[model samples]
Target: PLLQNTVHIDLSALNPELVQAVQHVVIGPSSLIVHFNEVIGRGHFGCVYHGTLLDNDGKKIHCAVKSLNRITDIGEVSQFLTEGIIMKDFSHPNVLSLLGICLRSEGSPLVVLPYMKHGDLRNFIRNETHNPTVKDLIGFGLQVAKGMKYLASKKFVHRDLAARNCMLDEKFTVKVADFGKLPVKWMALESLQTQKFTTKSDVWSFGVLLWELMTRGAPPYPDVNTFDITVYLLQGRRLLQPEYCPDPLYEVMLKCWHPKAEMRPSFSELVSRISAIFSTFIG
Candidate 1:
């Protein structure tokens, strides 16, 4: 939760070239230094690496570096710079912090982020789900909801919110991640049909995220063909409640999957609703 080496941006002072992808955020050489270490994961566009970052204040911190796969392409550079610009806007305990960026004249941009010790939430949930209590499942959902709420407060739509995109800290706190494209499996019905994303679409994904927690990382819409999830959703077919899923949790999931986006609950409502369920644990 402590964001030590991460860099925060002032939107008003941003240079004209930075927005045009002509250059990266103009942090001085003394401010941000990224040292790439090991590869943690790979994406279609790039790979995520674990690294050490030294900021302007002479403090070293562990971080994740997302590097573009195709550094030679100008399109790639523009995309990477845009991502860094968006990332620098966030500052929250339940959200990953953007540490700094490394931009070269020719190569791809490097996006630095706070390192998460436990990795993604889905992996963590599966590896640790031997005998979880109701409180444990609800707690993860609450943390994710809190992060989503913060994003919503910033007037940003996550568009994608799955267990895999949610990273966990050393203490297993869930922090929302993946500011780019999605895996399709975690997308909302309306988003798939219209390509227009809103806070409501994020709520739909959050429902699927909660399902992952309750089912201990089981794939959403498990038996359906990956392609058919969209068809099934169009047919009003929803994920059946997992045998271990609590009714209260299932109720929240149902609300998120409503046919109409306007009918979906807001992230703030989700946080409050999940917290209310948490109170039942001690009650």
Candidate 2:
């Protein structure tokens, strides 16, 4: 009998059943290759590259490849894989899609995703190319609300909803993007205190995100420091309406930031309300 032993696992040779059990697209390291053209985004743990993913089936597609940080621990490996697995399950037009995962001989794993030509919503709103109109803002808010409602229906919490986390496609479609990072000023009091998140917490961030759009990407809590968030929120203080924001929409944002999580309206309610606003105000 062996008393001491070590086990080795090959990621490439992972059993088909094991990979299939997760249900997301899993292309072996060899089957997928990335041709990096340029770096489009940067973060603490990784950078996003605009590239093409060449499939073994002879299809070449433009994609965004997120190369993760070097992993030294198996636990980190599991967490990183889980992030990709979760992303692959989302299929809504308003949500970002995960094409597949790839591994390289020289570096960490890469997450393949759809490339957004327009980049993040925060920058898009501030960009000089398009002059934003009131109708445009209402329509934009509606798309995001629909996406958030879809996530809520799936019992998944976005956890990190903010202007920067929303991407814009060529048509200026608001597709939710980025995960595993928290926007400090956009976070709820509960999230800041216990580091716990839920759909309600996401609602709070949605309020802040709406504020960003109304103000054309103004940073939240201009005067409040990160540490002061809990106290600031506790004092019943909230963001003031932007000069161009409609009164009705501002009220909706307030409901999202209700101090008590249970007091917040569901995303479905938000979607319908936004639709009503669009019909009455924009029309």
Candidate 3:
């Protein structure tokens, strides 16, 4: 018996092992039709396209399709599928969930995800039309912290936590996405030194994310060269407070960037602290 057979996929053209890895989350090959002309975002692996998926009942589901540019080898395909497998069981509101996977006979398989009209957080914050208030920005930070707290509980370390990787829905709710990358500018001290990553390192990245929000999407350490970030961070230097940021919020950011990883506040602690700060601005 098939497990939730709302959709069926032909394993003939796809790798059997890779298909089996995400079989439960797989959608029928013909279910999704991507608009190749409309490219939403570009990543190292491939481009994200706007697409529409036809469900069993003939309903149209708008989605973002992630497909590799080219398949070099079996290993590359396997690595790409791993991201879908990791997102398979996620149930948090703040964490981006995998809508489904569409494995094709041609170039590369596609990963289906909910379409975020506002796109990534960085661009959203940069846009002048939104004109977000300080309260709204703090709410966004709290949402990300909540998402990361859930991930930390799952023992998942987001090596690429940054404003660009976080997505915003049409309602402006933040959902963390683009789960895989090694962005040097966002790397923590321990991660940079030994290539080791833990929740604490992710916390450090969250600090940079908060700074990004405060600065309205400016790059972290814009004055420092990427190659020199390790040394700069090691020198006990941190991102300066943005002119618009309040003292309490910047204090929270400082705690996240503490030199000792062990001394950094946990994601749960961040939620509470950010929540308390958020309450201060609300009527």
Candidate 4:
């Protein structure tokens, strides 16, 4: 569970309790008394939590809840609506399913999603230290690229692609989470770049995600603030890609990370390249 926010809601106005409460949301249209739980994840926009969706008869439904902070700006509102619409239309094995959203409520807004128990990729990679190996590394990268390709085929950028944004299940299925972006970034891209999210940008993050996977899960900059990474991004370098790079897949990471933008691999190409290596290594 990664937290991302579009620029509509005043994140500063939200209290810790309210932020925590966002994770406990339960959403339904024909029925109310949605759900209860604590926020399992937190980011700049809001919090994410696991909640059991109850029907009109109080029966349990399985899903995760993404609590978007109350919104004010029309642009932020539009971003959320876009995500909701996108989720409603999307049905893929790799992508997280957006079950329904809480709208028509003047009080708060929540996005209902299928519950994933394994948590985000950041934590998953960290847990991998116990079983660190080249085989596992390539395998993870392969599965992630497979999902990303599916998303791109649908023309969805997943603007915020990263291991941190990927949620996992007990069976190792990775479900991407959090599509929120700053209106500033979204507008600038949507206006000029044709689309705010790009397959290459996904690859950029994919490179960093490779680092996350290779290191058996470490934050982008474990020793520094996110602003620090921003500063690095301003430069020609990314947070250093870690030294454990296997001989077989090292080039794949470099190719995906090229900052030239257009020269980078799209999700489709990425899937072909990484999956090939991963499959070979696993064999």
Candidate 5:
């Protein structure tokens, strides 16, 4: 995809930050990617790469590479370009920032999305699912909400919000990732107009995302759609709990998904609600 309007970045030239990744990450062909370095991701689809943009000294910037295979569908391609287009314009602290991309002639199109190696909200809660300390829930949960607030403020919507979408840096400052699904193109629409996605739809996705975080990255709706889900949700279905769950957060999620759509709270309201607990959410 042609990255128009965004600043053009050429990795061939050495910057201090690029050099750092080259020095430590085991660059391949050139230090830009260190072709020989082994992959580092826990997911799939031609990934396991890190971000290559820092300042002057090639610091190890966080990033991911989405490997585009021949089997990759049009939706995935559309989403990738959508993410690229949107990310190119967004450079915020709360939202995941897009550093340049790595497009080589030999390999599949590598889209360098922000990488947080500590794992997303998913990794943190897996082992500790049984006992979520107040500190843990409050800290991470607030960050997720803060990200949503930022997106809402920009009038951009993140349609597919979840733990997997939230990448974390060494400091655990969570950045929202995978925005390809934002500004969703609803099935009912004849064509995608720029404004198709709205705040309420984004908030609903946020609720699902919050559910993922609050539950410590547990999978949604364990017993429902194991096989397939073309007609997802059925409008009345509900995602189940994590074997056990504390009661306080359920209402917050419900508010996030105010059925009327128009009733959803604004990002400002969300920040005010959770700021006290999550210091990083202190924006």
Candidate 6:
């Protein structure tokens, strides 16, 4: 029998760079069919839909499908395609993985990823019923550190790193997601001033993420204005320690936000330190 739900992808028509980057993971439109359902998220580029992937064998895979709203500028196209290309190469358990990519003859291409029923870490942490322990919170941070450590090993900088970008799987594992762009409040001071991003800068954001974890996802630097952030950090101001946050953990966060990027701990250092802290909390 002929393959079902097949759509032809004219690789020759796509930008040569993108075509080469995604060649290995491209799914022949006919080999996999995506049935879009509810809108899970909306971003500057497009909407993420809760969808089902139907394989050639009629197998159904529940997944998240990210689709661009409309392709106009080459810059927008590059950002959208770049995300998928970056995700395709990630293999760590704590890093979000790309299931596949479907390039249609018309409209924007679709990037398929695993469905996280528990949703983003921010909401998960905020949910009152979870009653997360200190250990649980630190564990989440450790997982993110491990994921960031892997990205650093690959020499990739995650310009955006926060609790919201981290997703939780069925097993409650934290899988870092949504590669691309900036969130000023979570950004490092050097990054805020220089418009440069590096693994050390990501460590700075990880500090803010830890603050979020400790606060059960409260917004950081609540009393400060967004416009005054650069000045605020320049003055050596940092997010205050949460009521329940341990001294050692807060110390770790402070180290991450060191004014000099070189003074910040590496993700591997964070993993080891956080792991040590996490162990002490266990009964």
Which has the greatest lDDT?
3
- lDDT (0 to 1) per candidate: 0.77, 0.79, 0.86, 0.63, 0.55, 0.85
lDDT of 6 by residue, 94-153 (tens): 999998887776667788888898999999999999878888999999999999999999
Which pairs, if any, clash in model 1?
none
- Better model by lDDT: candidate 1 vs candidate 3: 3
Over 4 Å off, model 2? 1-9, 12-18, 21-24, 28-33, 54-59, 69-71, 104-107, 179-182
Q: List TM-scores for all candidates, in order.
A: 0.82, 0.85, 0.89, 0.68, 0.64, 0.89
Better of 3 and 5 by TM-score: 3
**Which scores higher on lDDT, 3 or 5?**
3
Please estimate how well model 5 matches the true structure, expressed as its whole-model Cα lDDT. 0.55
lDDT of 4 by residue, 61-104 (tens): 76666665655555555455455555665667777777666643
Better of 2 and 6 by lDDT: 6
- After TM-score superposition, the amount by which residue 219's alpha carbon in candidate 1 deviates from its true location, in angstroms, is 0.6
Give lDDT tens digits, candidate 2, residues 198-228: 9999889888888888888888888988778
lDDT by residue (29-93, candidate 1, tens digit) is 44444454567888887888877666656777787778776444355555567777777778888
- Comparing 5 with 6 on lDDT, the higher-scoring candidate is 6
In model 3, residue pairs whose N, Cα or C atoms come closer than 3 Å (at least 3 residues apart or on different chains), thus clashing, are none
**Model 3 residue 81 lDDT score:** 82
User: Which scores better on lDDT, 1 or 6?
Assistant: 6
lDDT of 2 at 258: 92
